[PDB]
Amino acid sequence: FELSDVKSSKSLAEIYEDDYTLSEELQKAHSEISELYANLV
Amino acid sequence: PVESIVLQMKSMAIHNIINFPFPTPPDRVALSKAIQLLQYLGALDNKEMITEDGKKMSLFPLSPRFSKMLLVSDEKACLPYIVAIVSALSVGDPFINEFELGINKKELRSKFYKSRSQFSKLDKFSDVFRLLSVVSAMDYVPKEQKEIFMKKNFLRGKLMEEIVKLRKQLMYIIKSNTSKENIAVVIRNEDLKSDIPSVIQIKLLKQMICAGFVDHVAVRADVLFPDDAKITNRTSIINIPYIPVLATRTPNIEDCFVYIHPTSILNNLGEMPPKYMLYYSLHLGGNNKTRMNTLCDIASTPLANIARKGLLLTYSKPLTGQGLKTVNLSPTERYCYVVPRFGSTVDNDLKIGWDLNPIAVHQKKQKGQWTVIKFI
């Protein structure tokens, strides 16, 4: 794990709010990877 | 009343009414009609067993028709008007008509017409509300103006006084049964007094009167049987035929027709009267035609809602077509459009039913019957 050393953009309410509501970004890369592979193929 | 006898016995869980060994039996025909009447009022279910509404009506000491009206009257503070109407109907008509006055002098008939138009403001097509107008107008007439009020408006003072007393007594019975503090209620003059009902209150009142007199509702002949009776704009209102819901189909339909009484507000209307009319009773008086004692006019869906509790209303299978999807929630629960049929079934040609306007409805399946819950 990596720990952020910069000021968090999310206010303390937001972090609690977000956790109230494996990774979307990771799946975002997966879709792009498939698109890049398909175009290259 | 024979229905009171049947209503009381059913509250005693006495099932066999027809073959009951009475010391002094009423006629079997009357008992059968009385049982059927209670079903229309929702007192007895399809299996001739007393319902929750039926138990309450048994407690009341009035006739079941008026008992039913008062029970459904505790909504939107319309009870003071219903008590006035029930009291006025029970005591009698306080209006001295032009025929009784022998003016059917030219200045006097004008005042008579002015006095009638004075009380006609509540609704154009209703005579019962006119009866409500004078009763409510009375309460604001001080003691020293009573005789002038009766003389000016051609009203019967003694009959009016009886009406006011009955209002207090009648209101006590209703609050005692309905209210939690059954015995403790005390009536006051201020409760009886009320202002003009709003338009929404007027519509609710017509529904409330319909509850008492569901079976006593008539339709125009033109709607059910076009061209069987010739109609035109030239025809006067008193000559416009109507048919009761439960009238037996004679070989000639003209016999089953009923006609509006001249004294009614419908007579001076000029325009085509309402298609559906609610009447207190029929009178053979008048050699030409049978007359109908009108109360008010009910629309299609309001009639369907009131007849829903009773057994006088039958429902079709779910309608399907353009924009008519039957939404289904569970195996025993669904929502669909249905065309209600009021009166006799289509198979039953002996009695004369009709079809009401289609309406959205919520249905729940009970005992294999998609019983209706409420209109959407």
Partner: protein
């Protein structure tokens, strides 16, 4: 198989999430709302459609069923039964009344029984009874 494919200001958070680990140690610790929303959708579907056209009390299918029983000749009813679409056939059979004395169900069986005797449209009459039992 053919059906198409488908915060509050006072955030009510408690427990280990907000650091109240003492509450958890001491033992202190929506489907109806979805049902309620599903209720709202059902009535919302009903306000969407407000057809007011005048329709008869009885459909054509059921009318011939009564007439066939009266005349003991369901040939007209069978002739239209062969003509309905498969969707139309299923709705009619499902819509048959199911209350005592079960007259409609008996009539439908009588109609099919006549069709079998004719030795025509054998497969269609068999599948109709399969739908009746279903």
């Amino acid at each position: 198989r053919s059906k198409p494919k488908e915060l509050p200001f006072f955030l009510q958070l408690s427990g280990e999430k907000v650091g109240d680990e003492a509450s958890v140690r001491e033992g202190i610790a929506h489907r109806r709302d979805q049902e309620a929303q599903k209720k709202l959708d059902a009535e919302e579907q009903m306000n969407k459609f407000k057809v007011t056209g005048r329709l008869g009390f009885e459909s054509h299918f059921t009318k011939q069923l009564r007439e066939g029983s009266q005349s003991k000749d369901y040939s007209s009813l069978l002739a239209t039964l062969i003509n309905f679409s498969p969707a139309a056939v299923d709705l009619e059979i499902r819509s048959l009344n199911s209350f005592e004395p079960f007259d409609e169900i008996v009539w439908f069986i009588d109609a099919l029984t006549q069709g079998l005797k004719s030795n025509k449209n054998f497969e269609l009459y068999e599948t109709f009874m399969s739908l009746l039992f279903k």
